[PDB]
Each structure stands twice: as C-alpha cells, then as structure tokens.
Design a protein around this ligand. Structure first.
Ligand SMILES: [Cu+2]
Ligand SMILES: [Cu+2]
Ligand SMILES: [Cu+2]
Ligand SMILES: [Cu+2]
Ligand SMILES: [Cu+2]
Ligand SMILES: [Cu+2]
Lengths: 341, 341, 341
C-alpha cells in the first residue's frame, strides 16, 4: 500500500555541524530522504600521528547527524562501495523492528539497500553498524556510529509548557578506540581492518580504551576548529556514545536544560554541572552563554579528557560580566603578616 | 507482640520466570513466606564450557525474583545445608535495619535462620549475601544475588494517574564474573570455592570482568531459551546488577516506561533507547511489542554484549507492520550511473 | 563598580563535618569570604600504611565543604605557600566564566589570589585544581578537590512545595587514587610529587584505581571515626567525586530524597536503594534513620567498597523497631525432617 507523502532530499554535513532544518514546523509529515555511504579508511586519531583502521558512515567519526520531526518517515539509502572489504548494515535506535533496521540492511561491497522507518519517538538517538556477533562491537568501535534527532513538530520545550529555541546546534560524537601496542608500548599500524582485527579484539576484551576522542581524533575541536558562540546564544550540544558511558561537562558553564537520557517526551533537568550519556545512547544539553572566552567541553573523567583525547573548546565572543565573576586581586606575594597553617 | 496477619507460602521459580502473583490486589497485608536454600556448586558459564565455582541462592544465578505488595511482611527462611563449606547470610535492599538483614542471618553449614522484614518501600530491589569484609564482594560476584519486587497494592502506574498492567514479566539478572587465567591465557579450574579464592581476588582487584552474563551463562537466554512474547503484549523486564553498572537496551524496541533507579514512588521516564542500572540496584522497563521477530536484549557496552556473554533474545510472534518499518528496496548492485564520494 | 553588600568571614572545618550555617535564611545576599591554603604533603591512604604524595586544599582529602545561599557572592582567597613545589588554581563548577575561575587563579608557590563568583545556581558542586593540560587530572587525583553547597534561601524542599530540613549534615568526598607498584607488586614510595608523576601517569592511563577512599584513606570513617546519628534524625549526606563515577548505598537504609545530579532546582527522587554520582559532580541524599545500629555507607561496586577502601560507617543510637524487621528464629540446626533440594 504505497505511502503518498511529499518527499524531501536532505544533504548531510560533516559533524560537528548539522544540516539545515526547522525547529518548529507546520509542515505535515514527509518522507525525508538520506544517503549514507560506508567508507573504510586509515585515519589519524591523535596529536602524535597515530593511525587507525577506521570504518565510517560518510567518511567521518561520528557519522553525520540526521534531523527530522515526529511523524516523518525516514528513507535511508545505505551504500557499501566495492572498494570496501566487509559487509555493513545500519541499526537506528529511533526505529521500531528488525533490530533497528539491521536485519533489513546487510549489504556486501558493491551493494546498496533502501530502508524506511517511521519517526514515532522524539529525542536524539544513536545509529550504528551491527553486522552480527563479534562484528557488532568491532564495527562500532572502528567508527561506524552517528546519531539522529527527532524533534517534536512544535520544537523543544521545558516540560512546563514553555518553548525552548536554540540559536546554534553542535553534534559531539564521542568514540572509544582500542589500538594495539607492540612489546615496547608503541601503537601498531596495519594495512587493512581485517589485519588489525585479532590484535584489536584482544584490547577490546580488557574494556579499557587507548583513546577517547570527539569528532574522530584528539584535538579535533580545539585550536582553529574550536566551536564558535556568542554571549546570549542558546546552544544545543548533542552528545552520543554508542558503546561506552560518558560524563559531559562544560568547564565554566552549566547545562541549563539537559535531557541526559536524550528523549524529549521527558522534561529536562535544570542547572546541571555534569551529565551522563549511557553507552548506547545520545543526550542533549542547552546552554545560554553568559561570559566570553574559552570553554573546555570534556568528559569529566579528566584522565580521559586530558590524556586520552576527550576535550573540545568553545571560543565565545562578547563582553565580560564582572557581577558573575571577577578577579578581586591578581596573583601577588603572600603578605609577610599572613599566618596560613 | 505477635503479628496476627494471614500467612501465605510462596513457591519460588527459577529465573527468568517469576512466581505467580497479582499486580493489583484488594487483599490486606499478609505475611508472605519464602525459603531460600544456599547451594555452592561448579557451574558452566560460557559456550566453550568454562566452569566456575559458583555460590547461589536456590541453585540459580540470579537467585529467584520474590514478589510482594507494599505493607506485606516478608518472612524468609534462609537454609545453609551442611554440604556447603562457607557461612552465608542475606541483605535485602528493600528492608530497613541490621545491614538489610545481614546482621541477623549469618548461618554456618548445617544451620537455618528466619528473618521478617516489612515491605515499606515500593520498587525492585537487590538482595545478596554479605558475610563480612572481603567475603562480601566475593560471595556476590560468585552468584549470591537476586531481586525482590514490592508492588503498590493498586499495581503500577505512569506517575500521571494512569494504571499500567503487564501481560508478561521476565527477570534478567546480570552477573559480572572474575575467572582466573593461567600463563597461556586459558581459564583455570578449581575443586572448591576456597581453592579459587586467592586467584579470583587478584582478578577482582583489577575491576575488569572476564564474563558478563544473563541468567548465569553466556547464551542462557538465546536459542531454544529465547524469551517469548507476542505483538501487542506489554512486557515488564526487571534487570538487576548487584556489583557493577549496566546499560540495558532492547535492540529493535524501546523502553516505553522505565524506572531506571527501580522505585515506583517515582514516575517512569518514557520512550528510552538505553537505560542505566547502577551497580547495587534493580530497575524495570515496560515495553509493548509492535513488531514480530527476533529482538536482542543487551547491555549496550557491545563488547560486553557480544564478546563477554551479555545478550538475551526475545522471539516475538505476530504480523509485521510495514508502516513502522519496511525494506523499500532489497540489496542490489550499486547503479553504474551512481556517484557516491 | 564596587559591590556594596555585607561581608561575612567563614571558618572552614575539616570533612566530613561542615561549618556552621543556616538552612533557611531571611538575610539578604552577602559576600561570603573563604580562604583555602594549598598543602602538598605525603599522606597515609590505607590500613597497611601505604603513603602517597598528596596535594590538598586545606590539608584534607576532600577539601572542605563551603556552604552559601543562592544570590550570595563567594570571595575566595587561594594561597599557595612557598613550601609547595607546583603552581595551583581553583575551578568551581558552581561558578560562571573563566573555566570556573581556573583561568583567573593560577598562582606560583609564594603567591595568593582573590576570586569572587556569584552563587546563581543551587545545588552541591565540585571544586578542583586544574592548572592546565595533563596537570588537570594529576592534581585532581592527587587530592585537589572538594565541594560547595548553594542552598535555596528557603532551604531544601521536596519539589512538591514541602520544606525538608536536616538535623545533621556530613560531606563524603570519594577519591580514586593511582599508586604505582614495583615489579613484585608492592606500592612504591616517592620523596616528592614531581618524582611520583611519571610512574603515576602510567597507572592513570589504564583508568583503574588502586584505592577508592572516603575522607582520604581506607577506614577513615570506620571505628572510632564512624559517623554518629540517632533514630528519628534526618541526615543529609553530600557525596562528591571529581574524576570517576560512584554508586552510593546506605546498607540497611535508603535514600528518602536523593538529588543524584545534585541540583536543587530539580525535584529529588524518593526511596532509592543506590544512587549514582557521575564523575565530576556532587550529589546529595536525605535519610531519616528508623533503626539503631551500625550502617555501612559504600559505593556499591562491592570490590571497591571492601577491597579498595570505600566503606564508611554510621553508628546510630536508639530503640530497635521489631515491626520493621525482626529475627523470628535465631540460627539453629536444620530440622532432621527438612527436605531442602
Ligand atoms: Cu560496518
Ligand atoms: Cu545499538
Ligand atoms: Cu554467601
Ligand atoms: Cu547491597
Ligand atoms: Cu593543584
Ligand atoms: Cu571540573
């Protein structure tokens, strides 16, 4: 029985940016058409140049953020070009049935498949590859995961009948990586994903990542690729982790409204310091910037953040508010008449 | 001052099934009588046949689910037969005082004890052995844990004054295990729990399980022992973890109503993808099945799920709903006129 | 533009105790003045006498609890005496801007600095040192963390318009420690924090603590330093963890009202068995004691609690309530006419 709705093709963009979309809409349901192309490739994952045999949707870690509204249909063309070596598929945590779509999307190199799922559940959700058995964790921790956001047609709200609107949106995908080391402790390089598998599985079994990165590599979202904002902007930060828990924190800020389980049928929590993304989920936080300067966005296992790669920066333009915070006295020698014991 | 209420003896059943009970009741408070018999025994824990020196309530990992109503008294006879080697006791997280009952239930082999506790707190709760000191974690991670559910007398509700009723209930106990390996990496076998202790404690101290299993072994709830359901059934899934965090996910489904901290005085969250069972707790999720087929129920550390044992299956009978999900085009060769870069 | 409010100097006290304060107040906003003095020193961290090169605020792990009200200004003098070897600073998760104050408070040995921040967000919050880069996790896991509580001016409430008042307050700071071992497995000793750094960073990178302690050492809050209470008292337990998740549980009790994300703009959850402190946060639980005796307060990874140091005790005076719990029959030989199979 053919589905007779308007069709809209969406052009995906690389994270941490997001394709153009409406928050609130008075459009009715549409068939929203997306294409994802699997790419297996070697990628650089840290500031010392360590390489890694990655597997990706659309060439990025994370895969791109897809944005639709409640009641839309999502028609995904998944493509596995013949230059790839492995079968792949896709599981949407937003979707109902057939292992999230994985049981309908297994494609060999040289094949494509078209899946349609109805967006009946609001929130941010993980999507990931899941070919079967031990291949499931391996494909996910090799980079084959992203997220989808299903907005209410009226946009976000505070759970108390007040509209919330973001000025800007970023998608932070966090990736735990398991890179083998040689006897001297140096990271090993491989010529293919298959050649890396046996040694990688041994690291995976001990459940301790070697790297924890945002946007696919240590330092990806620092320096020139810091995330921009302005004082007064309400920024939505979508965070996903397909395999392992995370505890996001905006250093110098807060989560004004946080959906840490990521589902917009639930009222957000207010005024959080640190929130929790359970492995296998996406969450989202709104924050209105009140001060200019550098902010560090981390997982608040600080060892992970500083030493394994999991720090992003915001660079925020505007005027400093000395009422909220001020340096009353700059660093100075301790007065000779001081005690301090 | 004798307690003059009606008495009701309950026959426990092995997980993942649950003894017969009423959801809503107009019976008044009763003294609900349960018996738990400690059994120390070697058990098989994985598909390669690895054995393990287990310690159990009633011969199973997890121990059986006990179900009562708010205001009931729970009178537990704990039995430690003389074939066992160790003292044991029981701590109910549902109970008030004396370390949950552990300080009133320490029994040597050849002894039994009778504890009564009032079910003043609604929810699902862990129970576990806790003899003292380093024996506490060792007995728990050797299998001595289960759960109890204290229903409201009116049954479950959505926290917004609507009744919720399940058609079916399953109890998923998740167990982290710490099995020693020899120099070549093979799992070691022992002739008694005491002989296994020193080597096991060394693995425990590094806080990384060798196995993470549902119902006591890898594959316990797959194949012929898959969990049955039907399209349209509302299924309650109780999940416990006495020692370590878990992140349950129903692959191809959702949590319609989830009490992730497990306590029915709190409204459930709606429409979750993945929830979080904090170590030392039980939680519960309702889901109404909408699609037939195989579902995988996992902890969404996919390494744990696929490679350390933590996958169950549901086999769901009914009619496929192509409105919720459909394969628009089956796998096919990528069209020669395609780009895809 | 000078801030013309009354000033009040607060004398901090060592955890787990808390400086005197009012819960509800009709005082207007004040400038609340605190002093923190960094102390680097060797400390004993376990019952076998293992030493550790610690770095502290005010000589304690955790640093002391600071208590203010919503709308107060907090003026902190941070002092780094010239006997210390390292630069230090302070980041308040309660504060807005400049990395929580860290970007305005970096002081060398022999210097002090004065920071003022407005307490615009209610809750319990972590504070910690964060000098920059890999020094951030190292200073935090060396002991440089504490907490601040920002009460509503009307005191706590249940989120349903009922006042909650505590009779007693304790602050439990949990610390994950990473102590190097020699080839034979013995803990290594060092003559300075700098000498310990390289070996410590190697342990930190594997993300598995050697010790998990409350109030700075295994057994700190047991024996003669058990926490006192009485039957009928409502006790607030503030719990912080600056780097790593925790799952608090009061053995033999409950959390009557729990703010596990720690922020008093959110209604507490009721009747919890175990709650969850995400690393990089503080939470709080109220409990009204109903039974006398010993209670153990743990993180409910029982391996951490029993074997790595993370157990406190409450000693509760009062009368036992046999309605809530009773030993119906003391331990006795299993009757000869018993079955039990
Ligand atoms: Cu794949
Ligand atoms: Cu998944
Ligand atoms: Cu036992
Ligand atoms: Cu317990
Ligand atoms: Cu410091
Ligand atoms: Cu911090």
């Amino acid at each position: 029985d053919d589905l007779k709705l308007p069709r809209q093709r969406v052009d995906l963009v690389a994270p941490p940016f997001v394709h153009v979309h409406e928050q609130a809409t008075k459009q009715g349901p549409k068939i929203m058409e997306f294409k994802l192309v699997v790419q297996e490739k070697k990628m650089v994952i840290d500031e010392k140049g360590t390489t890694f045999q990655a597997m990706t949707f659309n060439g990025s870690m994370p895969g791109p953020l897809m944005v639709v509204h409640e009641g839309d249909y999502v028609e995904v063309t998944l493509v596995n070009p013949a230059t790839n070596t492995m079968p792949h598929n896709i599981d949407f945590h937003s979707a109902t049935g057939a292992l999230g779509g994985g049981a309908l999307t297994l494609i060999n190199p040289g094949e494509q498949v078209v899946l349609r799922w109805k967006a009946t559940r609001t929130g941010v959700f993980v999507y990931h590859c899941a070919p079967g058995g031990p291949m499931i964790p391996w494909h996910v921790v090799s980079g084959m995961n992203g997220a989808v956001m299903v907005l209410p047609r009226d946009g976000l709200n505070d759970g108390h009948g007040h509209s919330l609107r973001y000025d800007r949106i970023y998608y932070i995908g966090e990736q735990d990586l398991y890179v083998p080391r040689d006897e001297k402790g140096n990271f090993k390089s491989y010529d293919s994903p298959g050649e890396a598998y046996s040694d990688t599985e041994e690291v995976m079994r001990k459940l301790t990542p070697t790297h924890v990165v945002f946007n696919g590599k240590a330092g990806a979202l620092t320096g020139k690729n810091a995330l921009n904002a302005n004082v007064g902007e309400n920024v939505l930060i979508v965070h996903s982790q397909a395999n392992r828990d995370s505890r996001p924190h905006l250093i110098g800020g807060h989560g004004d409204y946080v959906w840490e389980t990521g589902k917009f049928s639930n009222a957000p929590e207010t005024g959080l310091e640190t929130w929790f993304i359970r492995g296998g989920s996406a969450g989202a936080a709104l924050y209105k910037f009140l001060q200019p300067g550098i902010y560090a966005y981390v997982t608040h296992n600080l060892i992970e953040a500083a030493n394994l790669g999991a720090t992003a920066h915001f660079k925020v333009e505007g005027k400093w508010n000395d009422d909220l915070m001020t340096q009353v006295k700059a660093p100075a020698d301790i007065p000779t008449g001081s005690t301090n014991e």
